[PDB]
Write a protein that binds this ligand. Structure first.
Ligand SMILES: *[C@@H]1O[C@H](CO)[C@@H](O[C@@H]2O[C@H](CO)[C@@H](O)[C@H](O)[C@H]2NC(C)=O)[C@H](O)[C@H]1NC(C)=O
Ligand SMILES: *[C@@H]1O[C@H](CO)[C@@H](O[C@@H]2O[C@H](CO)[C@@H](O)[C@H](O)[C@H]2NC(C)=O)[C@H](O)[C@H]1NC(C)=O
Lengths: 224, 213, 164, 109
């Protein structure tokens, strides 16, 4: 049985969202749709649930009155609406189904959605600023010296980073991006190279942000 | 108010080394306990319910066990897809949707010390009014590690931000970046910036520091 | 019986402060989840179950059979989600009758998938007499009553086939 | 207990009715307890009745027993926060018919 939902939502703080959850398969609708939430890197948290026949949904102590859950049994879809968003409300919102039928004691969640990511940011499309992380006396360890690029303040995802137009593969670690307090993404890409290649081999990081249509190639020089 | 605690938080086990997980509750949730598997980037898949019986479509490597306060999850021979996060859900006390923090299973390999590198902010960035100090930990195992920020011999608080790659395709190791950010002026107000690390490598605490200028 | 006539006494839509909707697929009509036709399952409305009252003064010129029920949940969870409160009660009173029942929450073997139960009681409401339903939860209310008359009693025969 | 002995089973349990709150507290730690027994057919809940009664064998407290017939392939469910007097044994049973009880005082030959 397939619970399918909308995906990838981007909203400003102080605005509302409404995450739909459509039920395909054998629709009983005497079964309870449960809403679960997962902040990036953190665990799962029950937000509430609704059973279409009985109406009158439940809410956890934390998301009580901060959220409201409805359902349309004619369209076989359940909605979880978050009134008035905050930066901390940026998370994934799963809709699950239970073993169902109140009185069965089987209150495990047997079916799920794919999840809906709600990124709460007041920004719009913005190209990244690229800064060099220069290899120095501190960035070198014996034979290997490391260097990188700071891809700061862009929106939204994704951003693609290559080194020397794809000529450099080994030793490259491009990190997962993070959302900042500004509601702006930022990440770093790092290479480990032979310490002796500085002064001979030129290292350029090529950053691509298709949403803003900006293509930045940044050269990284060593320091002393 | 049932408390669910899973130990260990992270589990390091070889492919076929028979991984065993443990969930423990503050009170007795009797026979009503479920296990979920969440592979990174996806929704949780139901594995075990009723602490013993397993859900439809689930292979037989997964075996639940236990009752009362202590439970257990068993995977006989690990696999490719079997490296992920596992949660336990109690359902006796209202509300029956309290979850456990979870246990992360990764690929067991030889103990790897990181290589600690540190970068000062770019002058090109300083012109923009902000300053970003970056501390890098390269190629380490296991994922468990701690990073301390120290400016002018003073501990930083809430200005840090960290990002970790997943387990590498080849050598199955981790990399972590820790960037502290200041305004340009505040950056110019101090001299020595330092990040200290405790993973393993003469068993702590190798540090990396630069004097401003 | 000399006379048996089903009449409406407490209409389903008379409860504006509760949810008359509700049922399970253990009682299913056309694959859809449903419930007993002449019964009403009162649940919470607006995340609140205020005390449900109901009365019927009998004037059909005959004695009336009236059937009600209470819900015995399998667990506290369904008690809370459905009737919003624990420590509820069902109260039924007439001139002769004074009966109070409480929900009995406990885990039972599964019958038609449910560990919960529904216990029904009945009464004969005399002519010109009123009945009083009063419950803070778990009440399964009658929507209909039955006019009844008897000249005498009889029996019940098991045959399996053909009235001629 | 899920019944598989191939026969109907007689099962007997009991609840404790204390003489005073003191023995209730010292024994079962809590007041406002309950005993719950359920099967497919059975749903019975009993509460402790704490009150001072005349002494029988020195005790003012009482033990009230109930029983049931657990069908084949059927489960029974005991659940109690106190005062439960649990069965350790059940009794397999069969009947072709009923009989009676005779008082004689002496000698089966
Ligand atoms: C129930 O209804 C009956 C009428 O259907 C009521 O009986 C009458 O009450 C009025 C008002 O006092 C009297 O004048 C009549 O003499 C009564 N008729 C009969 C049956 O003889 C009865 O009062 C109602 N019960 C209540 C109080 O709800
Ligand atoms: C009680 O035990 C009996 C067996 O002794 C169980 O009955 C069997 O249940 C299995 C699993 O569904 C079925 O495959 C068999 O067909 C059943 N056998 C019979 C009696 O025909 C029964 O399920 C148990 N009760 C529970 C659920 O605790």
């Amino acid at each position: 049985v397939q619970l399918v939902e909308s995906g990838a939502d981007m909203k400003p703080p102080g605005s509302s969202v409404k995450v739909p959850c459509k039920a395909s398969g054998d629709t009983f609708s005497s079964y309870t749709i449960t809403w679960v939430r997962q902040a990036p890197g953190q665990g799962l948290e029950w937000m509430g649930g609704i059973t279409p026949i009985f109406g009158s949904p439940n809410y956890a102590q934390r998301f009580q009155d901060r959220v409201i859950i409805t359902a349309d049994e004619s369209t076989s879809t359940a909605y979880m609406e978050v009134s008035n968003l905050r930066s901390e409300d940026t998370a994934v919102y799963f809709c699950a189904r239970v073993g169902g039928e109140w009185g069965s004691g089987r209150y495990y969640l047997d079916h799920w959605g794919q999840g809906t990511l709600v990124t709460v940011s007041s920004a719009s499309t913005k190209g990244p600023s690229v800064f060099p992380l220069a290899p120095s006396s501190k960035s070198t360890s014996g034979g290997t010296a490391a260097l990188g690029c700071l891809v700061k303040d862009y929106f939204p995802e994704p951003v693609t980073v290559s080194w020397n137009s794809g000529a450099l593969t080994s030793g490259v670690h491009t990190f997962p991006a993070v959302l900042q307090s500004s509601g702006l993404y930022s990440l770093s890409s790092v290479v480990t190279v032979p310490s002796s290649s500085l002064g001979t081999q030129t290292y350029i990081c090529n950053v691509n942000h298709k949403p803003s249509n900006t293509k930045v190639d940044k050269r990284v020089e060593p320091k002393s | 108010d049932i408390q669910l605690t899973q130990s260990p938080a992270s589990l390091s086990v070889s492919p076929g080394e028979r991984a065993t997980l443990s969930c423990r509750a503050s009170q007795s949730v009797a026979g009503n306990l479920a296990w979920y598997q969440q592979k990174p980037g996806q929704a949780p898949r139901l594995l075990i319910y009723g602490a013993s019986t397993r859900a439809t479509g689930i292979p037989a490597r997964f075996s639940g066990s236990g009752s009362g306060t202590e439970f257990t999850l068993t995977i006989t021979s690990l696999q490719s897809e079997d490296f992920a996060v596992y949660y336990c859900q109690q359902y006796n006390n209202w509300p029956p949707w309290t979850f456990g923090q979870g246990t992360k299973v990764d690929i067991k390999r030889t103990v790897a010390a990181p290589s600690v590198f540190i970068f000062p902010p770019s002058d090109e960035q300083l012109k923009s009014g902000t300053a970003s100090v970056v501390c890098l930990l390269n190629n380490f195992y296991p994922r468990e590690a701690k990073v301390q920020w120290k400016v002018d011999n003073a501990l930083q608080s809430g200005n840090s931000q960290e990002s970790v790659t997943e387990q590498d395709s080849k050598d199955s190791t981790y990399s972590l970046s820790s960037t502290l950010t200041l305004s340009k002026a505040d950056y110019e107000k101090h001299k020595v910036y330092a990040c200290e690390v405790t993973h393993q490598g003469l068993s702590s605490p190798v540090t990396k520091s630069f004097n401003r200028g | 019986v000399k006379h048996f006539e089903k009449v409406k006494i407490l209409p389903k839509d008379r409860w504006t402060q509760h949810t008359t909707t509700g049922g399970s697929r253990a009682c299913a009509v056309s694959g859809n989840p449903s419930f007993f036709r002449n019964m009403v399952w009162l649940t919470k409305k607006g995340s609140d179950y205020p005390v449900a009252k109901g009365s019927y003064n009998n004037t059909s010129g005959e004695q009336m059979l009236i059937i009600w029920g209470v819900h015995h949940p399998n667990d506290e969870t369904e008690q809370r989600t459905l009737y919003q409160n624990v420590g509820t009660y069902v109260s039924v009173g007439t001139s002769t009758l004074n009966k109070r029942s409480t929900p009995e929450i406990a885990t039972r073997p599964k019958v038609n998938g449910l560990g919960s139960r529904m216990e029904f009681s009945w009464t004969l409401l005399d002519m010109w007499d009123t009945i009083n339903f009063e419950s803070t939860g778990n009440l399964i209310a009658p929507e209909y009553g039955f006019k009844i008359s008897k000249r005498g009693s009889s029996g019940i025969m098991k045959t399996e086939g053909t009235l001629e």
